[PDB]
Amino acid sequence: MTTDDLAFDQRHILHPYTSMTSPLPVYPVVSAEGCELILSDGRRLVDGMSSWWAAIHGYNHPQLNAAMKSQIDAMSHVMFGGITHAPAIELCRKLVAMTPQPLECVFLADSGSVAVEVAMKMALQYWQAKGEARQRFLTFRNGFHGDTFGAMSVCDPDNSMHSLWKGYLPENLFAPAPQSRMGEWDERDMVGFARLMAAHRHEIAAVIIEPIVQGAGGMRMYHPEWLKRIRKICDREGILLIADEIATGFGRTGKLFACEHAEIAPDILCLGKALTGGTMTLSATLTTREVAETISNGEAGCFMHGPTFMGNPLACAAANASLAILESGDWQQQVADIEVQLREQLAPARDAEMVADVRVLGAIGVVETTHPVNMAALQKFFVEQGVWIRPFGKLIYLMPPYIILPQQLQRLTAAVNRAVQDETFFC
Amino acid sequence: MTTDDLAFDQRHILHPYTSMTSPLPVYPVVSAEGCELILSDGRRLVDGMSSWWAAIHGYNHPQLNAAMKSQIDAMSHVMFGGITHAPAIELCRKLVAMTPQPLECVFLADSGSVAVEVAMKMALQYWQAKGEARQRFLTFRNGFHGDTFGAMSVCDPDNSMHSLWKGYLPENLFAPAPQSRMDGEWDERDMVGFARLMAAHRHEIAAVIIEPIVQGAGGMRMYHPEWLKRIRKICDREGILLIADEIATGFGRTGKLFACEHAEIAPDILCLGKALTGGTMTLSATLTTREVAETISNGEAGCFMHGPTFMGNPLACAAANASLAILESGDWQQQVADIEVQLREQLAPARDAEMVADVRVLGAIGVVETTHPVNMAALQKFFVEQGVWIRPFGKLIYLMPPYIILPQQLQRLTAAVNRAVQDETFFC
Ligand code: NA
Ligand code: NA
Fold first, then answer.
1. Contact B29 A78 (CB under 8 A)
2. What is the C-alpha separation between A346 and A361, in angstroms, rounded?
3. How many angstroms does the Cα of residue A98 sit away from the middle of ligand 1?
4. Are A291 and A126 in contact (CB under 8 A)?
5. How distant, in Å, are the alpha carbons of B51, B53, B107 from that of B222?
6. How many other CB atoms are there within 10 angstroms of residue A329's CB atom?
7. How far is B174 from B154, CA to CA, in rounded Å?
8. What is the C-alpha to C-alpha distance for residues A169 and B296, in angstroms, rounded to an integer?
């Protein structure tokens, strides 16, 4: 990449949630291997982010690579309308088998946000078929479910700046963010949620939440009793429960799916990010026979969704290979060990002036700060320390690949601790 | 693939818009090469669909394969937050250069529907930054823009069964489907509906959104380019943004590189997908102007509020770059031109078949509209038996073959379409 290439990127290429009028530096990556990113200048960076949760097996993984190359040899893509193929069948077999018993109907899609849209549409079509006027979603504050309009409608109104779209977005119900920490349970936590359920139980199509960990909305970690209660309340009212595990799925919190922490099964389950081992985009929305059949037995005669690249063979083959790595079970002790190291090595941030809170769960470590980070200055600091840590707002957090070496993890936690010692990298 | 595999698929795997309780047969594909799909049992089928527009270079294309494997060796994926990479830069360079001058800012995304959502959000954020209360979209009937909530809100309400979501989806403005044909003459009467809507709602419209020249999923309709010219000028005069959804028409399918070229206009926002990657995997792009991109970033949010996890995926960008590189030769122009003449000539006889209502052809798109709905299971079986993969829908038997299709292969497709419509055997 020439200097001109970098200049072109700056002035012509949009990046996630960042200014085009005051663009901040971006770092040119040429390749990646193991748990490292390689910059164009040759510098190697230990990846603390897993490219946002997804790359649970690191980069240039020989098994993932071989499975992708082999599927390219057969066919990278063929349409899914009137056609099926081995990669999709093998993936759906794995997803059905590894998720709770009732979850046995799979709708593959292209991205997490679309998987949520699909889940929301399922709930709406389900009640339409049952002849019930139910179009409200009940969710938690500080939630994040994606960027498309339907998904946006259940994201935190404050965090997601709903004022920007006031009048275009359907108005859903927002219960208080769960207070009880992943910590003791306080029954008073439930009041707000109960109030909404009582006033709107006739109207609610589904409850949608991120189980245990609220990711993009604040990296919050709450008590599993909440899920137990939400499942019971949904059962009692006959309301559908959507669990968005696009960030928590596939081992990240220490259990295969975060719903396990409460031993509950949702009616609809959304999966993404780490589904493919972070090689390329793919998502899946699973639901029950009751939901899927009911929908097909309504006026539309089918579930009304079907993206062009639905069931893409290449992505399915990558997901199959990623799941085959998880099948070994090594991730269990890998995450447990990561959790121990995160707890131990982030503990000192609790003596730092710029820290508001420290919390760890599985392969997730979060240092919440008192003031917003200086994105440009802090990003450069991390790069100079030989690490790729991507903070945002008042969060400096780590979600490394499960295969990260202890010495690599140590470089990450050491950098985080150093960054929070004084105000240098803040505001 | 075993029969047990096929039973599992039927019982547990949803497919695009089709019943789970009364599913029709799906055919098991094991591989594909050139212009052929290879079924589990060994049967080879000439692909007439390009896997829904996308596979313009066919299957197992050497250049696409080589580029994809080479990128895998470097990195299949890395996040785009605070990071950039060569595949993304090369792709965006190509996209900026090949599209109209004002379209110089690129937002890469995951799918066509997401690209439309991005376009709609850009329009909404643009006006919010300018302090104007504009939240409505003016679109056309028979339009199709995707299946996510925002996209659904501008899709044809009858075709898409908006009654299912009545009260949840926002209610946009729907001008009548364009009547004047791409084959035929312009009729100024075509404008009254649109003119009446713009006049009544000019002050609240954030954007006009349309598929240029060809309305795909909504009816395989082919309309007169004067429409785009007229719309562009109206948008210009009114200060309203124009969104051209070229997810199906982009990259040469209608005979021009982008269907907007037929009218020699440029939209404010351009959506691309399907053939972007040569149909190897999903990727999309939404291009806009500097005016739009800067205005949004200067508003309250300080940025355009979107950013999907897999944004800028190196592997898909590498595939797209290789696909665009093939198009750079310009060979597609002649290929598409030749396909167009053969489609016109070989579908023409169908106009005399009793089951046929209309025959229309544009670029590498050939449509035979019938008088009655097709019998999906029976007709699909028939096509497979003729050694062709043609996927009909409703009253439409259409072809959109890969540009590399051989004349003999194209003839097998047209022969099959003609034979399918000779009597009512496969209808209703
Ligand atoms: Na299951
Ligand atoms: Na351009």
1. yes
2. 12
3. 6
4. yes
5. 20, 16, 28
6. 10
7. 8
8. 19
Tell me the nearest-neighbour CA distance from A160 into chain B, angstroms: 8
| CA dihedral of residues A342, A345, A346, A352 (deg, nearest 10) | 180
Contact check, Cβ <8 Å, A307/B51: no
What is chain A's alpha carbon radius of gyration, rounded to the nearest angstrom? 22
CA atoms of B417 and B389, how far apart (whole Å): 11
A236 CA from centroid of ligand 1 (Å)? 22
Does the beta-carbon distance from B149 to A150 stay under 8 Å?
yes
Domain-wise residue ranges, chain B: 1-60+331-428, 61-330
Nearest CA among A23, A43, A87, A45 for reference residue A280: A87
Which among A37, A105, A307 is the nearest to B78, CB-wise?
A37
The domain defined by A61-329 carries CATH number 3.40.50.10490: no
Amino acid identity for residue A126 in this structure: Y
Please say whether the beta carbons of B304 and A18 come within 8 A: no
In terms of DSSP bridges, do strands A44-47 and A83-84 run parallel, antiparallel, or are they unpaired? unpaired
Q: Does domain B61-330 sit in CATH 3.40.640.10?
A: yes
Burial class (CB in 10 A: 0-12, 13-18, 19+), A418: middle
CB-nearest partner of B14 from A32, A114, A303: A303
Give dist(CA B27, CA B93) in Å, integer.
39
Q: State the resolution, in angstroms.
A: 1.8
**3 state SS of B18:** coil
Residue A260 in contact with residue A266, Cβ under 8 Å? Answer: no
Helix, strand, coil fractions of chain A, as percent rounded to 5: 40, 20, 40
Residues of A in contact with B281 (CB under 8 A): 76-77, 280, 309, 312, 314-315
- Cα A110 from Cα A242, distance rounded (Å): 18
Q: Do A307 and B273 touch (CB under 8 A)?
A: no
CB neighbours of residue A272 within 10 Å:
30
Write the class of the CATH domain A1-60+330-426.
alpha beta
CA dist., res. B234 & res. B193, Å (int): 14
Q: How far does the centroid of ligand 2 lie from the alpha carbon of residue B95, in Å? A: 7
Residue among A12, A74, A280 minimizing CB distance to B316: A280
The first and second tokens of residue A415, run together, are 């950098």
Q: Spell out which residues have Cβ within 5 A of ligand 1, the ion.
A: A 96, 99, 103
CA of A78: which chain B residue's CA is closest?
B51
User: C-alpha angle A33/A34/A36, rounded to 5°?
Assistant: 70
Residues 6+ apart with CB under 8 A from B101: B266
Say whether A75 and B32 touch across the interface (CB within 8 A).
Answer: yes
How far, in Å, are A54, A297, A311, B3 from residue A91 at the CA level? 17, 26, 9, 17
Rounded to 5 degrees, φ, ψ at B256 are -120, 160
Contact across the interface for B13 and A88, Cβ inside 8 Å = yes
Residues forming beta bridges with residue A45, ordered by sequence position: A37
Alpha-carbon distances of A215 from A253, A261, A408, B356, rounded to whole Å: 11, 16, 23, 55
Min distance B395 CA to chain A CA atoms (Å): 17
CATH number of the structural domain B1-60+331-428: 3.90.1150.10
Length of chain A counted residue by residue: 427
Return phi, psi of residue B65, to 5°: -55, -50
Name chain A contacts of B21, Cβ cutoff 8 Å: 293, 296-297
Experimental method: X-ray
- CB atoms A84 and B20 under 8 Å: no
Strand arrangement of the beta sheet that strand A364-369 belongs to: A355-361, A364-369, A395-398
- Please answer whether residues A52 and A405 qualify as being in contact, where contact means their C-beta atoms are separated by less than 8 angstroms: no
Residues of chain B with C-beta less than 8 angstroms from the C-beta of A170: 168
